[PDB]
């Protein structure tokens, strides 16, 4: 039965008809429907022979499945295989997303569901808009499914089509008088979503069709977004639309120059200077009734520049590339504000350019400001912490001295980000917990990298004190990995991943100095993992004992000097002396083992099942439970 279901599912997936026709031959409708009801997961995605036939494109197979066989359009399947694989798929939806117009019109004439909503309540109409197939949309509109079925983010089919370049589909959809003011809660008014890829004729049509320009959820006009994304022609159209509002025009030109200053894809510095020249000229055009820049303080990251409130001083910085980049970033910060999402990335790119040009102090300042601005908005900043790890490791490799205040500030930012990361992990139970856990583990890894950088550097008394304060704050918070590792456990192992860039130059694990600093900082030395092992258990299991033996001779002498019961005997009844797997490690442990209490005097009475359940003191309960 199940094998026959796989056979008919593969036959429908392939496209043959007589194969599953003979497989269903001489059978009643019960097992025939069961074979057609094979909704089981294939490739990790739920799929059905009718669904996979609609996903195939063979109108013949589905025309047999609806006419000569009894299958229903109410079914579960994929709607978008790349990155979405969302369930609750109608066969008509699968055909519309795949783009087979013949299958779409055949299912419509059959009477398939045209107003179906999935868990993300997405219509086949917006799938047809996503595919850009005009005739499918025309057939669906003529059959009058809907026009205003939006996603859970209130994402209209019009906005989905405007995000792509399907100008014909957009113009046909607005020909049905679907309003462009379908304001999503994210902030898209169908022209924000047009103004990323620069679909010039889509914006042309929307402006022709009374798009009714309005701010987004971030407080940015679509003209501002178009200037932010370095798309000049849509900036031209949005400027030539409705009210000019000269202040908005000037800030739009300034934003266009700013974004052209520090964007990786579009980097035309002369274009930046000329656009800022237009901005300054229209600023100082009329003479009197002049507009003026507000006096924002000189932000310490971008040097200490104070913008250009005069065309003359803008002319002065014509050839200065560094000054032009800084001016662009400063005016970008002024206009876009500090809370907006798109201000962080150009600062990171300029910092990357300076870092690859070995101007390490300036890029540290720029990236530190970027991290501050990202944590003010409370975003996903694990990549930026990793970037600090990379640049600090390269700084150590090129033996340039590392500023202790900067590493202190990035350390406290990392600590706060780990705090809110585990808060999000607790809050997000199982909806999106996997990547949150992965990023939390990567955050711990970056924390170890930064601690290693701090150890490799020379700092003053108060800076070392601040580093110790931050590290002690994290330890008292006690982060724990997915594998149950405590932070010290992560410091003592040998399989901790190290990033492919310059971290491999200096972030060698296990490290003696990192473990010593954590242990002196007040780390829980007797901490246990989910597997039951401890720090001594992991460190004796090192596969490279004499490669860096001195480091071992530190870490082993460190743990014995601070707690770390040498005969802990992990949950699978293995003392770390037994888990030594190396003569050097067991010799060092034997030189550091001590004649002791009912640990060696209780190994026998725990190997033999002696009842300790309230027959021994409460702390001695855990004492036996270890030993």
């Amino acid at each position: 039965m199940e094998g026959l279901a796989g056979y008919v599912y593969k036959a429908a997936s392939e496209g043959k008809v007589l194969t599953l026709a003979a497989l269903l031959l001489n059978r009643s409708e019960s097992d025939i429907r069961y074979l057609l009801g094979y909704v089981s997961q294939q490739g990790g995605q739920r799929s059905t022979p009718l669904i996979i036939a609609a996903r195939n494109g063979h109108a013949k197979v589905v025309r047999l499945l609806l006419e000569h066989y009894r299958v229903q359009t109410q079914q579960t399947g994929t709607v978008r295989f790349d990155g979405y694989v969302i369930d609750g798929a109608t066969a008509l939806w699968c055909a519309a997303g795949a783009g087979h117009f013949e299958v779409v019109k055949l299912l419509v004439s059959h009477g398939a569901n045209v107003n179906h909503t999935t868990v993300t309540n997405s219509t086949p109409l917006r799938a047809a808009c996503f595919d850009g197939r005009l005739d499918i949309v025309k057939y669906l509109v003529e059959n009058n499914a809907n026009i205003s079925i939006a996603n859970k983010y209130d994402n209209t089919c019009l906005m989905i089509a405007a995000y792509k370049g399907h100008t014909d589909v957009v113009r046909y959809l607005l020909e049905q008088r679907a309003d462009p003011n379908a304001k999503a809660h994210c902030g898209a008014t169908a022209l924000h979503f047009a103004a990323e890829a620069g679909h010039i004729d889509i914006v042309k049509e929307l402006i022709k069709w009374r798009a009714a320009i309005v701010v987004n959820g971030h407080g940015m006009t679509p003209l501002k977004v178009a200037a932010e994304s370095c798309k000049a022609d849509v900036v031209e159209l949005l400027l030539s639309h409705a009210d000019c509002d000269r202040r908005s025009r000037i800030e739009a030109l300034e934003l266009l120059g700013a974004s052209f200053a520090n964007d990786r894809e579009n980097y035309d510095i002369i274009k930046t200077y000329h656009y800022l020249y237009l901005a300054m000229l229209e600023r100082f055009q009329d003479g009197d009734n002049i507009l003026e820049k507000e006096v924002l303080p000189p932000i310490h990251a971008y040097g200490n520049r104070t913008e250009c409130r005069n065309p003359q001083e803008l002319e002065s910085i014509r050839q200065d590339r560094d000054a032009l980049h800084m001016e662009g970033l400063i005016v970008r910060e002024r206009i876009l504000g500090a809370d907006n999402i798109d201000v962080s990335h150009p600062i990171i790119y300029r910092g990357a350019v300076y870092a690859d040009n070995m101007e390490f102090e300036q890029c540290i300042k720029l990236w530190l400001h970027a991290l501050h601005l990202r944590q003010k908005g409370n975003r996903n900043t694990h990549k930026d912490l990793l970037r600090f790890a990379q640049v600090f490791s390269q700084m150590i490799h090129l033996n340039e001295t590392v500023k202790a205040p900067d590493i202190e500030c990035v350390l406290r930012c990392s600590v706060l980000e780990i705090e809110q990361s585990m808060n999000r992990v607790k809050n997000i139970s199982d909806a999106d917990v996997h990547n949150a856990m992965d990023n939390y583990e990567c955050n711990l890894y970056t924390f170890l990298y930064l601690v290693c950088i701090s150890t490799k550097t020379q700092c003053s008394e108060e800076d070392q004190c601040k580093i110790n304060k931050q590290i002690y704050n994290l330890i008292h918070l006690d982060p724990r990995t997915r594998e149950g590792f405590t932070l010290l456990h992560l410091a003592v192992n040998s399989n901790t991943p190290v990033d492919d860039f310059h971290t491999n130059d200096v972030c060698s694990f296990p490290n003696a100095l990192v473990t010593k600093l954590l242990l002196d900082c007040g780390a829980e030395v007797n901490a246990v993992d989910n597997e039951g092992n401890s720090a001594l258990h992991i460190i004796v299991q090192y596969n490279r004992p004499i490669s860096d033996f001195l480091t071992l001779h530190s870490i082993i002498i460190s743990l014995v000097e601070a707690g770390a019961h040498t005969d802990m005997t992990n949950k699978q009844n293995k003392t770390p002396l037994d888990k030594s797997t190396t003569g050097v490690s067991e010799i060092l442990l034997k030189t550091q083992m001590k004649m002791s209490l009912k640990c060696l005097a209780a190994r026998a009475v725990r190997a033999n099942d002696i009842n300790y359940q309230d027959q021994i003191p409460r702390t001695l309960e855990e004492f036996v439970g270890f030993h």
Binding site: A355, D356, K383, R387, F501
Partner: peptide, 11 residues
Amino acid sequence: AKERAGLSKLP
């Protein structure tokens, strides 16, 4: 590779 090249699209 370069840090600028490794800056990710983020778009």
